[PDB]
Amino acid sequence: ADYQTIYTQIQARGPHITVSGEWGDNDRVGKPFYSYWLGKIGDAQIGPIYLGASGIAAFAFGSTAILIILFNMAAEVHFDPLQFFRQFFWLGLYPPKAQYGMGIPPLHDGGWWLMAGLFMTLSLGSWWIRVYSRARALGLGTHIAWNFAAAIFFVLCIGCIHPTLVGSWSEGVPFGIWPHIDWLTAFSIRYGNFYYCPWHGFSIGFAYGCGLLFAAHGATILAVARFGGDREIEQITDRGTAVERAALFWRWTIGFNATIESVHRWGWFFSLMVMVSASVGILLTGTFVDNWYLWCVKHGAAPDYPAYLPATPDPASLPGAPK
Amino acid sequence: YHGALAQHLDIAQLVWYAQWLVIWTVVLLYLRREDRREGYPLVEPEDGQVYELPYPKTFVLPHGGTVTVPRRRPETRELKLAQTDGFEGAPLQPTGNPLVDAVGPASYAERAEVVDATVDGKAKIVPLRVATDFSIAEGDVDPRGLPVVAADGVEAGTVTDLWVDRSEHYFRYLELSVAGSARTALIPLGFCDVKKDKIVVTSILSEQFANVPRLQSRDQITLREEDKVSAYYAGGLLYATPERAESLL
Amino acid sequence: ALLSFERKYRVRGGTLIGGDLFDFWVGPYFVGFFGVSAIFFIFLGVSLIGYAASQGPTWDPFAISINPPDLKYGLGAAPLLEGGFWQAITVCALGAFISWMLREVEISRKLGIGWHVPLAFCVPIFMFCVLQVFRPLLLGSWGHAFPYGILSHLDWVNNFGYQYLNWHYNPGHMSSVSFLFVNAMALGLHGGLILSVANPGDGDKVKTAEHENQYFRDVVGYSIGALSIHRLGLFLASNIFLTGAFGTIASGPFWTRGWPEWWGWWLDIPFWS
Amino acid sequence: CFEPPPATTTQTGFRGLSMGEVLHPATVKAKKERDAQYPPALAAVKAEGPPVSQVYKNVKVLGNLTEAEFLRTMTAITEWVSPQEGCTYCHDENNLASEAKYPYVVARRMLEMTRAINTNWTQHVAQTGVTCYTCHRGTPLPPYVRYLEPTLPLNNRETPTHVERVETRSGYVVRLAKYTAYSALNYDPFTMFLANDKRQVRVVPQTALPLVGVSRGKERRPLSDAYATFALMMSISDSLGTNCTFCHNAQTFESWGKKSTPQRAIAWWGIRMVRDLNMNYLAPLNASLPASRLGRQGEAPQADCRTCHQGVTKPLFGASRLKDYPELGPIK
Ligand code: BCB
Ligand code: BCB
Ligand code: BCB
Ligand SMILES: C/C=C1/c2cc3[nH]c4c(c3C)C(=O)[C@H](C(=O)OC)c4c3nc(cc4[nH]c(cc(n2)[C@@H]1C)c(C(C)=O)c4C)[C@@H](C)[C@@H]3CCC(=O)OC/C=C(/C)CCC[C@H](C)CCC[C@H](C)CCCC(C)C
Ligand SMILES: C/C=C1/c2cc3[nH]c4c(c3C)C(=O)[C@H](C(=O)OC)c4c3nc(cc4[nH]c(cc(n2)[C@@H]1C)c(C(C)=O)c4C)[C@@H](C)[C@@H]3CCC(=O)OC/C=C(\C)CCC[C@H](C)CCC[C@H](C)CCCC(C)C
Ligand SMILES: CC(C)=CCC/C(C)=C/CC/C(C)=C/CC/C(C)=C/CC/C(C)=C/CC/C(C)=C/CC/C(C)=C/CC1=C(C)C(=O)c2ccccc2C1=O
Ligand code: HEC
Ligand code: HEC
Ligand code: HEC
Ligand code: HEC
Ligand SMILES: CC(C)=CCC/C(C)=C/C=C/C(C)=C/C=C/C(C)=C/C=C\C=C(C)\C=C\C=C(/C)CC/C=C(/C)CCCC(C)C
Ligand SMILES: CCCCCCCCCCCC[N+](C)(C)[O-]
Ligand SMILES: CCCCCCCCCCCC[N+](C)(C)[O-]
Ligand SMILES: *C(=O)[C@H](CCSC)NC=O
Ligand SMILES: [Fe+2]
């Protein structure tokens, strides 16, 4: 019963360490403030917060996007603000319903959509710059920045690259809680079941793998919490007994093992591959596959099961059936 | 058809092969080699042992020094165990007292005999008598004063100080004077159940607090010392009483 | 056989059952008592699967399916061809998974470490029972469970969802998904970070904990610390199934309509109807 | 929140595919009792005398019948349509050939419609058939109808809230959501698909690869249709009180054969019947109806899947009166 793995028993307040950026130490803002309940599962110290050009550029475009989305969402309930709160989840800003091709659609039919997307895209861009620049400033690998790039590329893939490659803004993801969800079913329906897209599968594999890996890694570091296993940077540069045992648990269980560093490579890679795999599938979808089921059938992948109720010919194709 | 090629070959089909290739490449030729930077090469030229390893890398340590991996680096220490059998995969059997002999779960890694350091260069892990500007938090127990009770329900000592991590603001050890041996032991908060009137430690018996590893100064600790100390109490989990080796059911 | 540091940790002890009769290794693998019972069940299971697969149509591993029985057979046994083999395999699987988990316990004791890993591994073993056992008991039929096949099982997931019209609106699902997604983000953020510290490259110096925590304070204004991210990771991942289980179990026993319609509780309050 | 166990389950696809119905039995019993209020058939009559076409003045459709038979018909019509209002509802007390009251002329057309259904749409209504009751359930306004916009509540026998009222534009999103089984799907599958034969329901490609010349820019359909089709399918599901798997194996919604139940066939005929009903029989009654019946663009109330089914996979749990009233079809 290592309770320290569950919560910090005796917390320890102390004076706020500040590591110095190559630049922008003056752009750090706010007073640190400690917090007892938070400090029971985490670090008690909240703030300060760096607040760069990139960071502010993000809040700018982010809001302009949010405002566009929200003004449209109000208009859907002809501005009665009670119904706005009731109906929030159901409201949205849709792309074109009509087929304008790559033509810039009118504002009343998803031009406002297009607009908000531009600004959201700019927002993710400046925020990427933050995540990159801060690493370079504190003298750190740009690893986080790249994983995050993959993520951003996936968002571009679904929201504007794929639309472009098939040439219709109509295939964009709406803004809205339920409507961004409803997109997923209409998209999958259209492209012949996404379960039969192999890139979907790859994505899901890595996604479930991330579950498996963090569950396991987290659990491991906690199991060797008593021998300092959480101090990972030193267990890299000077292997301690924490990670000796951590490695031996896994070798004796599954036959092979990692190092305290390489497991983070494994994790980083798996994370990164959810977004990569996803992106590939979307790029191939519509452009070089119209129906993932029939493509699987074409290549002999799909299962078949026998009829339970009588098989049923399409009555459209019977002799002299209606339109 | 968009995306068709000669004889029932489409692009998505090739990309399928490509993807798989990429995965196995990264997994085998990269990730699994990276996994061999410590522990290798294995034990009892030679062809397989060269192929399985990656080109070494060198860490450019923050306070001078460099570490390169992988490297030859084996157990100098004479381990106090013998063979349960002839069989190559059979277990080992501690010959001495395992808690002090430092074997099985009481084993420690030959880490640096070096005091772990902060960013600015000071000792990271230190007691509060030194790091006076770190307090205990408004709300939590101050264990200094409280008695330490061992697995045999026996008072073994009195808590005299907490040892704070200055880089992370986290207490890592309690210091305690051992009853009737004018000496002062560290114990990691892992093995400590912090109640309001006492600290409970079911990992070792009262009598075993005797032989908890002593440190170099009594005001700092080396990375190795930390291993030696922690290892001790964990070794207790299997060894502190004869019945803990034996199978629970 | 042995890693440069392995030999010292390889002592007898820490078994749950059967003393030092099964307390040994085979290459890298600790063979516990469960080591044995695991292999026993795996053998049986993998046998049953191949025997059942041969009695079926194809051999393309993609199109092989061992399905459970029709619903009419209720909670009884069924003929080996028409769903029994599935029942057998299901048991062998549970045999194997539980064995696997308890073997991890035995290993955890011999190293003097926490049992956090076997614990965490109860989460997926649990969810398996939710799908294949608990929910089926509640609907009175094994046929409600999921077929064992690579692509066949995806069609079970597919239709099960569409039985409740738009499964995306299942609130337990929304939770579950939300956890899946955040856990993957976290894992990248974490693995990223630890590497970003050890590997800044250009032979520039290796960084510190202070640096780790500085990075996140800068970017998002808070940093949870090193030990806490592992606790948090375990928490996040484990809740994918812990929350999703409620979502799964609800569907059928405690809810027969479309999941979107369940959100009537909110939409159709009189105060704003 | 949550409905208690147990649930009735059925099986509609091969074992291990989680295809089938899921019904809370309480909910079914409630509907069974509603649907059981169908008045039974009046005892048959001695078929004596001339045809009514040589007797009564203004008898166009039912001139085939005897007097006894014909009044048996008129009695049942009254039961099914205007039980509370009486014969008085369609006739002048002093002249039964007077067409002065609008319900007379409509009821004539409704007879023609009802016979038409039972004769030309046997591919859907089968041995069972329909009567005036199937739709009307004892009011002259069938509880379940559609105007060319969304309307709430779905049952027009309940009084609407302020928001529910079609006038009130805040509630448009909710009006629509409730036709589509509470989804944010933003399409009126009635006017798009069931009001006329103008739009094609199928959206999915029948090739694995994208065919050149229909696959890029304006030559391709918008994704919006796929949202719309789904919306129709949400609606159909709920109008029968069932789910997707009653009709398809989700593996491929687009495929027929053993990826579809016989009930998907029957539903297909259902769509086409429903259209012929709206376009040729029901919609053109804005000629005859008062403006207090019409919608907000002078549209008659038209019929949807629900109009007949009312949340049951067979309307009135498959109860027929067809043998008992040969005058309502089929006709030779
Ligand atoms: C309700 C949710 C379900 C679901 C929904 C689902 C979806 C939507 C998708 C999958 C996919 C997959 N699922 Mg599945 N699933 C699987 C296994 C699988 C794999 C075939 C594949 C990718 C797994 C992965 O990478 O995970 C993370 C673990 C990793 C990376 C460790 C390696 C494991 C290795 C890949 C597993 C290989 C499995 C073996 C072929 C089966 C055992 C063989 C016998 C002889 C020992 C098992 C073994 C189980 C059990 C026993 O419960 C299961 C339950 C479920 N899945 C539920 C029924 N699954 C993906 C796929 O591509 O379909 C085929 C996919 O797209
Ligand atoms: C009927 C519906 C189907 C469907 C439709 C679907 C589609 C259409 C797509 C997927 C995709 C995927 N599906 Mg899914 N799916 C999945 C799992 C998955 C994911 C692993 C994968 C990738 C998406 C992701 O991680 O985004 C989470 C991460 C995102 C969205 C990136 C966000 C990054 C960004 C930086 C966020 C920043 C936020 C902003 C700062 C906030 C501010 C915004 C303001 C200003 C508005 C499972 C496990 C199952 C099961 C068990 O049934 C399943 C079933 C289905 N999927 C059904 C078959 N699925 C994707 C895929 O891989 O396909 C090949 C995909 O494109
Ligand atoms: C139309 C169909 C829908 C659907 C239907 C669906 C259903 C019916 C269920 C889910 C569930 C879930 N869905 Mg899904 N879903 C999900 C995500 C998810 C998962 C987070 C969640 C849990 C999966 C699970 O139970 O694995 C289970 C995996 C297990 C049990 C693995 C056990 C592992 C085992 C112990 C060890 C195995 C060992 C191997 C055999 C050994 C072999 C390997 C070798 C090396 C030896 C996403 C991200 C999406 C997207 C993007 O749209 C989506 C869309 C949909 N889901 C569609 C809308 N979903 C589940 C849930 O929780 O619902 C709320 C669920 O029941
Ligand atoms: C497998 C790969 C995974 C992955 C990976 C990665 N994802 C990253 C990184 C990596 C590596 C980053 O480093 C970066 C980051 O910075 O995190 C630390 C980031 C991001 N991923 C976010 C959200 C997300 N990832 C999703 C998915 C996946 N990600 C996939 C699964 C999803 C889903 C599931 O939809 C969501 C919703 C945001 C938190 C963030 C962008 C903010 C922005 O562009 O702002 C733009 C402008 C705004 C106004 C919005 C800001 C509001 C947010 C919620 C919070 C702002 C913080 C605020 C300053 C707090 C102050 C309070 C304080 C005083 C107490
Ligand atoms: C939130 C919780 C997460 C989580 C957590 C953890 N996961 C762990 C641990 C933790 C902590 C470990 O300690 C343990 C391990 O050792 O580390 C590798 C483990 C493991 N996670 C595996 C698979 C895995 N984890 C999944 C999910 C999550 N994990 C979630 C996300 C998923 C999916 C589908 O998502 C998969 C496929 C194995 C690799 C391994 C078990 C080996 C075993 O049990 O050996 C013994 C059994 C065998 C070797 C084979 C048995 C064959 C049977 C008898 C017959 C057939 C079986 C089946 C009926 C076939 C179905 C057909 C199929 C195509 C439909
Ligand atoms: C033949 C016979 C009779 C044998 C008897 C002996 C016996 C019982 C043997 C068992 C035989 C069997 C069934 C072997 C199969 C073993 C299995 C189930 C292997 C599957 C492994 C899989 C698929 C893992 C997926 C997860 C994954 C990508 C892992 C790669 C990275 C690794 C190795 C992570 C484990 C790992 C984690 C998670 C850390 O956090 C950590 C921290 C510090 C140091 C090391 C580690 C570490 O190694
Ligand atoms: C409307 C929904 C009606 C109700 C209720 C009743 N009647 Fe009717 N009646 C209706 C129509 C449309 C017609 C013409 C039918 C046709 O074949 O064209 C009739 C006709 C009659 C007649 C024939 C008299 C004549 O038109 O010369 C009689 C004698 C008659 N109806 C009587 C009758 C009685 C007794 C009713 C209550 C039991 C009753 N009708 C109800 C429409 C509707
Ligand atoms: C559904 C397919 C129907 C069947 C079968 C029958 N009727 Fe009907 N009827 C239906 C609709 C949608 C409407 C329009 C709404 C309206 O009430 O105007 C009607 C209308 C009538 C009316 C007019 C009543 C009024 O406006 O108050 C009458 C008198 C009527 N219907 C009678 C009637 C009879 C006698 C039927 C069987 C022979 C019959 N209807 C069938 C829908 C449907
Ligand atoms: C029967 C009473 C049905 C139920 C319940 C559901 N669907 Fe259906 N669907 C049905 C028919 C008869 C048709 C063909 C319509 C035509 O005019 O030809 C369809 C069609 C679809 C499609 C389009 C298929 C294509 O070829 O492109 C989809 C994508 C679809 N249906 C999906 C779907 C879903 C998700 C359902 C549950 C909400 C559902 N359908 C129910 C019959 C019936
Ligand atoms: C009244 C004229 C109807 C309208 C409008 C719709 N349906 Fe219908 N349906 C009707 C009858 C009388 C029957 C009798 C079936 C029997 O044999 O008892 C049916 C049947 C169906 C079925 C078959 C159900 C089964 O066999 O289990 C389906 C699947 C069905 N109907 C679907 C359906 C749809 C989708 C409709 C709107 C497009 C629709 N029906 C309208 C009567 C009437
Ligand atoms: C230059 C030319 C002319 C234009 C093309 C430029 C371009 C790249 C356009 C569009 C790009 C893209 C990628 C669009 C993609 C849209 C996507 C993927 C949307 C997905 C999800 C949207 C959701 C969940 C929207 C939710 C909206 C709200 C909650 C309302 C806004 C309010 C908020 C408080 C934001 C909270 C968001 C969440 C964290 C809870
Ligand atoms: C496509 C996104 C464009 C947004 C540009 C605005 C951000 C400018 C950031 C300045 C970078 C300063 N620097 C190098 C010191 O970090
Ligand atoms: C479907 C997603 C792909 C994930 C594949 C990764 C599985 C791990 C492979 C481990 C290889 C083990 N070994 C002994 C060969 O090194
Ligand atoms: C693909 O659509 C194909 C194109 C012929 S010309 C490039 N159509 C014929 O099958
Ligand atoms: Fe870590």
Side-chain angles (χ1 to χ4, degrees), chain A residues 75-98:
Chain A
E76 270 222 310
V77 298
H78 206 244
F79 298 89
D80 163 13
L82 187 61
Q83 296 311 293
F84 188 85
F85 281 70
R86 181 200 187 190
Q87 307 177 18
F88 187 68
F89 293 88
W90 283 261
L91 309 171
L93 173 49
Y94 302 90
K97 293 194 184 187

Side-chain angles (χ1 to χ4, degrees), chain A residues 23 53-54 57 61 122 125-126 129 133:
Chain A
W23 66 93
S54 63
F61 303 130
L122 287 161
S126 10
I129 287 163
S133 106

Side-chain angles (χ1 to χ4, degrees), chain A residues 4 9 11-13 17 36 40 199 226 230-231 238 241 245 251 257 261-262 265-266 295 299, chain B residues 10 12 19 30 32 35 57 105 107 111-112 116 125 135 140 166 170-172 190 192 194 226-227:
Chain A
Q4 296 267 127
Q9 292 180 99
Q11 289 177 50
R13 297 287 162 288
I17 318 220
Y36 180 85
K40 281 206 166 307
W199 280 274
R226 351 197 94 160
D230 62 290
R231 288 153 73 183
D238 188 7
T241 190
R245 300 157 196 255
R251 193 185 189 71
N257 62 266
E261 189 185 15
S262 69
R265 276 162 210 293
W266 279 101
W295 181 92
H299 302 292
Chain B
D10 57 279
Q19 173 96 18
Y30 182 79
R32 295 288 300 128
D35 298 348
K57 67 193 289 161
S107 314
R111 307 195 71 178
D116 201 347
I125 291 165
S135 50
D140 284 326
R166 275 202 261 175
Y170 191 95
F171 292 122
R172 310 267 182 180
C192 283
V194 171
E226 292 190 69
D227 271 50

Side-chain angles (χ1 to χ4, degrees), chain B residues 46-63:
Chain B
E46 215 275 52
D47 266 45
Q49 308 233 253
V50 184
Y51 304 148
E52 72 182 353
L53 306 169
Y55 294 126
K57 67 193 289 161
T58 15
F59 288 123
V60 208
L61 290 172
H63 305 300

Side-chain angles (χ1 to χ4, degrees), chain D residues 42-106:
Chain D
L42 326 194
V45 291
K46 219 99 183 57
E48 263 157 29
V52 286
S53 51
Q54 297 156 19
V55 170
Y56 297 122
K57 301 200 78 187
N58 184 35
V59 179
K60 311 283 184 160
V61 174
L62 294 168
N64 230 23
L65 300 161
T66 348
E67 210 192 328
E69 292 192 317
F70 178 92
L71 290 161
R72 174 163 180 286
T73 308
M74 287 286 137
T75 298
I77 282 173
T78 313
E79 251 192 334
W80 296 330
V81 184
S82 55
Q84 301 230 125
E85 295 78 8
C87 317
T88 8
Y89 185 79
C90 311
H91 295 284
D92 180 69
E93 289 163 296
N94 315 129
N95 183 17
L96 307 193
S98 195
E99 304 180 3
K101 309 203 171 196
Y102 74 78
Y104 188 104
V105 317
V106 183

